[PDB]
């Protein structure tokens, strides 16, 4: 399709079941360890994928620490927008 992923996630007994990481010296995070079976997976999140939105709000330029807060903070639902960094460029 065309507009970007939008995994939508609900909280499970052993978290999301994913990992995110950010670069150095460098902004942006990254989806890095899909757990099997987890909401994660189910939701269609992928590792590789570059995070863009996380409940309505672009998270690209903020710090790692920023992007992680507003995940953990949010009531145990989050809609993760992502894009194949491959194909997709923000300018
Ligand atoms: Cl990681
Ligand atoms: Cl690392
Ligand atoms: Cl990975």
Redesign the pocket.
């Known amino acids: 399709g065309m507009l970007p992923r939008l995994c939508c996630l609900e909280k499970g007994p052993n978290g999301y079941g994913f990992?995110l990481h950010g670069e150095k010296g460098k902004l942006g995070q990254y989806?890095?360890?899909?757990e099997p079976g987890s909401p994660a997976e189910k939701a269609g999140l992928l590792?590789?994928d570059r995070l863009v939105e996380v409940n309505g709000e672009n998270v690209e330029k903020e710090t790692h620490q920023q992007v992680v807060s507003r995940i953990r903070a949010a009531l145990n639902a989050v809609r993760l927008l992502v894009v194949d960094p491959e194909t997709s460029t923000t300018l």
């Open positions: 990992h989806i890095r360890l899909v590792a590789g």
